Each structure stands twice: as C-alpha cells, then as structure tokens.
Amino acid sequence: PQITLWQRPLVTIKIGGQLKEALLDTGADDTVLEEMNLPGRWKPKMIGGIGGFIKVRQYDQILIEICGHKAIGTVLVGPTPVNIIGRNLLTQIGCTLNF
Amino acid sequence: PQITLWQRPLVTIKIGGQLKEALLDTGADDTVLEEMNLPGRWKPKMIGGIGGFIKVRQYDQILIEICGHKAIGTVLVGPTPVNIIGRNLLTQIGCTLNF
Numbered sequence: 061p062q063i064t065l066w067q068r069p070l071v072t073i074k075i076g077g078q079l080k081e082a083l084l085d086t087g088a089d090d091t092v093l094e095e096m097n098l099p100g101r102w103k104p105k106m107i108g109g110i111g112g113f114i115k116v117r118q119y120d121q122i123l124i125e126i127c128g129h130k131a132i133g134t135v136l137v138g139p140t141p142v143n144i145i146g147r148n149l150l151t152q153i154g155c156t157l158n159f
Numbered sequence: 160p161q162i163t164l165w166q167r168p169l170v171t172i173k174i175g176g177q178l179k180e181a182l183l184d185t186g187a188d189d190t191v192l193e194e195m196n197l198p199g200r201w202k203p204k205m206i207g208g209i210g211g212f213i214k215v216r217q218y219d220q221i222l223i224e225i226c227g228h229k230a231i232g233t234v235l236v237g238p239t240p241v242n243i244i245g246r247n248l249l250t251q252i253g254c255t256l257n258f
C-alpha cells in the first residue's frame with residue numbers, strides 16, 4: 061500500500077501472538093517496542109533520541125508481521141511512549157520513500 | 160526519487176541560503192533543525208523525543224529546499240542531534256511511504 065503522511069503512519073503489527081499498533085519510523089535506526097517479555101536471549105543496550113537516552117533490552121532474530129508482511133530481526137524493548145518500527149525491519153518488508 | 164532505507168535517508172536541504180544535510184523522518188510530526196539564524200518572528204514550543212522534551216524555537220512560513228522540492232512551513236530550531244524533516248514538510252513535497 062501507499063501511506064500518505066497527513067497523519068502519523070500507524071499500522072497493525074503481530075508479534076508473539078499479540079496484536080499491536082506501531083509507528084513506521086524512517087528516522088529510527090532501530091525497532092523499539094513498549095515494555096514486554098519476548099522469548100529467549102537478550103542484552104542490555106542504550107539508545108538515543110531527542111532529549112535523551114533510554115535503557116532497553118535487545119532481542120535478536122524476532123519475527124514481526126507488519127501489514128501482513130514477514131520481517132525478522134533485532135527488536136528492542138523499553139520505556140518508549142510509542143511502539144516504533146525502524147529501518148532494520150522496514151527494509152525487510154520492502155519499505156521505501158517516494159516523491 | 161525513491162529512497163531505500165538500508166541507510167539513514169539523508170537528503171540535501173537548503174535554508175536561509177545554507178546547504179545542510181537532513182533526515183527524512185516519517186516518525187516525526189515536526190521539522191526540527193540544529194541551531195541557526197532565521198528571519199521573522201518565533202514562539203517557544205516543547206517537543207518530545209524518546210528521552211524527554213526539548214525547548215525549541217518555532218519559526219513560521221520558512222522557505223526550505225528539500226531534495227529539490229520547495230516547502231514553506233513551520234521549522235523548529237533547537238538542541239537536536241540531527242536535522243529532521245518531519246511530516247509537516249514531507250506532505251508538502253508529496254512524499255509517501257510505499258511497500
């Protein structure tokens with residue numbers, strides 16, 4: 061589909077059974093979701109955005125379905141006021157900017 | 160053009176007769192640029208990132224060349240670690256997310 065930008069580019073995502081809302085974010089290197097458990101191994105990481113850094117949990121080789129599109133990769137979990145789909149997974153569903 | 164996301168979407172912008180590099184950010188409501196001079200009046204505004212809020216200066220109806228496309232709207236200026244083009248201007252230049 062083609063998503064215009066008059067509104068926030070929010071879509072539905074499925075991860076580990078649960079359905080969630082998430083922002084398709086081209087200004088994000090990383091994918092970061094609201095605090096939750098994910099199966100298996102994780103590492104502490106620090107990420108930086110506007111107005112500071114937050115401490116998160118890095119989970120590798122995680123599957124998320126985004127608008128009925130398979131995408132596997134690193135998923136960060138932490139105190140984010142919004143679920144953020146970053147480039148690492150956007151590339152995986154063939155997401156591009158056009159104008 | 161069609162910009163892929165295997166790398167930070169960094170385009171050439173022109174503002175106040177200065178060439179800068181800026182990030183095409185779908186996950187940003189606003190356009191935030193690093194400290195610089197701009198003509199006209201400004202208001203104060205708070206904006207929130209991942210880490211917290213920052214104090215920025217709101218300038219209205221500022222001309223800005225984004226990847227060879229004219230936009231005239233609200234530009235925020237303040238302590239941001241990256242030049243961000245947000246949805247207010249991305250819509251102006253007819254930019255869309257596609258996949």
Ligand SMILES: COC(=O)N[C@H](C(=O)N[C@@H](Cc1ccccc1)C[C@H](O)[C@H](Cc1ccc(-c2cccnc2)cc1)NC(=O)[C@@H](NC(=O)OC)C(C)(C)C)C(C)(C)C
Pocket residue numbers: 085086087088089090091092107108109110141142144146184185186187188189190191206207208209240241243245
């Ligand atoms: C390497 O740095 C990153 O890629 N950092 C990303 C990051 O923070 N990416 C930044 C760009 C960057 C890069 C390097 C260094 C500083 C910045 C812009 C993102 O795309 C964010 C998303 C967001 C949206 C919304 C909110 C939020 C906050 C409060 C309430 N509700 C929602 C909070 C975060 N928009 C923002 O930070 C924009 N925020 C926004 O639109 O809020 C409405 C802003 C401030 C640029 C206009 C991150 C998401 C992986 C952490």
